[PDB]
Design an enzyme around this catalytic site. Sequence first.
Site, PDB file in Angstrom:
ATOM      1  N   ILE A  71      93.752 -55.394 -10.312  1.00  0.00           N
ATOM      2  CA  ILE A  71      92.953 -56.732 -10.350  1.00  0.00           C
ATOM      3  C   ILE A  71      93.023 -57.178 -11.794  1.00  0.00           C
ATOM      4  CG2 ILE A  71      90.585 -57.799 -10.250  1.00  0.00           C
ATOM      5  CD1 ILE A  71      90.123 -55.535  -8.259  1.00  0.00           C
ATOM      6  N   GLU A 160      91.828 -48.823  -5.344  1.00  0.00           N
ATOM      7  CA  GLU A 160      92.005 -47.378  -5.311  1.00  0.00           C
ATOM      8  C   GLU A 160      91.997 -46.825  -3.739  1.00  0.00           C
ATOM      9  OE1 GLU A 160      93.151 -46.012  -7.730  1.00  0.00           O
ATOM     10  OE2 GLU A 160      91.712 -46.122  -9.230  1.00  0.00           O
ATOM     11  N   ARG A 163      95.213 -47.408  -2.245  1.00  0.00           N
ATOM     12  CA  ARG A 163      96.293 -46.691  -2.771  1.00  0.00           C
ATOM     13  C   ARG A 163      96.182 -45.007  -2.212  1.00  0.00           C
ATOM     14  NH1 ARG A 163      94.608 -48.579  -8.589  1.00  0.00           N
ATOM     15  NH2 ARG A 163      96.005 -50.032  -9.207  1.00  0.00           N
TER      16      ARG A 163
HETATM   17  N1  LIG Z   1      91.831 -53.437 -13.201  1.00  0.00           N
HETATM   18  C1  LIG Z   1      92.148 -52.397 -12.430  1.00  0.00           C
HETATM   19  N2  LIG Z   1      92.735 -52.853 -11.128  1.00  0.00           N
HETATM   20  C2  LIG Z   1      93.128 -51.899 -10.255  1.00  0.00           C
HETATM   21  N3  LIG Z   1      93.019 -50.620 -10.417  1.00  0.00           N
HETATM   22  C3  LIG Z   1      92.575 -50.228 -11.678  1.00  0.00           C
HETATM   23  N4  LIG Z   1      92.551 -48.905 -12.203  1.00  0.00           N
HETATM   24  C4  LIG Z   1      92.105 -48.931 -13.272  1.00  0.00           C
HETATM   25  N5  LIG Z   1      91.931 -50.225 -13.679  1.00  0.00           N
HETATM   26  C5  LIG Z   1      92.167 -51.071 -12.666  1.00  0.00           C
END
Ligand SMILES: Nc1ncnc2[nH]cnc12
EC number: 3.2.2.22
Length: 246
Positions: A71, A160, A163
């Site tokens: 993001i 997350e 993923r």
């Molecule tokens: N800004 C971010 N966007 C997506 N996953 C992440 N994991 C750690 N920081 C993140």
Amino acid sequence: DVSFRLSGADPSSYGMFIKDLRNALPHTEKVYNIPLLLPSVSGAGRYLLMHLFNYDGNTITVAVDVTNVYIMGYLALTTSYFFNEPAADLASQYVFRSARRKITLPYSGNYERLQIAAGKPREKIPIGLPALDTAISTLLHYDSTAAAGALLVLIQTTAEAARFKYIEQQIQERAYRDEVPSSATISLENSWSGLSKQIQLAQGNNGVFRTPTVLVDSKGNRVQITNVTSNVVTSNIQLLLNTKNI
Ligand SMILES: Nc1ncnc2[nH]cnc12
Ligand SMILES: *[C@@H]1O[C@H](CO)[C@@H](O)[C@H](O)[C@H]1NC(C)=O
């Protein structure tokens, strides 16, 4: 692009959103049957816009880099917000241009900096659908301390989950009640780049990892992943960070 509504949301509509999120990310190749994210994308095409609606139907639009699911920033009403990092600065040249003002958050977007800003680690921040609803609401009214915590929630419940199928399920389990993430969830979040790398190196190494990945399992025990037959590889990870980006 992709959309999620908190109002009337259930594990099923959330499952559908996360499927859409995954499907929005381009790839030309699957490695061991897992979509491999592109080394890079030029221009505006690099960024996916997620439209998120809180229970009241208020919306934010979140900008995600399709090569790494990171993001970069979001738009709330007429104000855009971006992390204090070069990659997000670049993103700001392409997304939410029509915003009346642009605020740069007083932190970068990585977990360490976000946890400092929020005053607590991910381990102590409840997540789930009600937490996502709260997070959307918080981001709608600028408050940098509260926003840090909101972003930790938002990140875990969107990127997350995309993923890792296990994280998606953790959130479906928290559809109507928040709960701090299991350590297995934290472990997976931490290992994404490392697993992505090792799955890639496994090609031309007969599916064997050059270096083992240490995770924590659902039951809470520390395990090591050494090859592509592991359930983490066959039945969990859904997207691979391209090795060019590691
Ligand atoms: N800004 C971010 N966007 C997506 N996953 C992440 N994991 C750690 N920081 C993140
Ligand atoms: C692959 O990993 C499993 C554990 O998931 C292990 O039992 C097995 O010994 C490994 N195979 C090889 C060839 O290393």
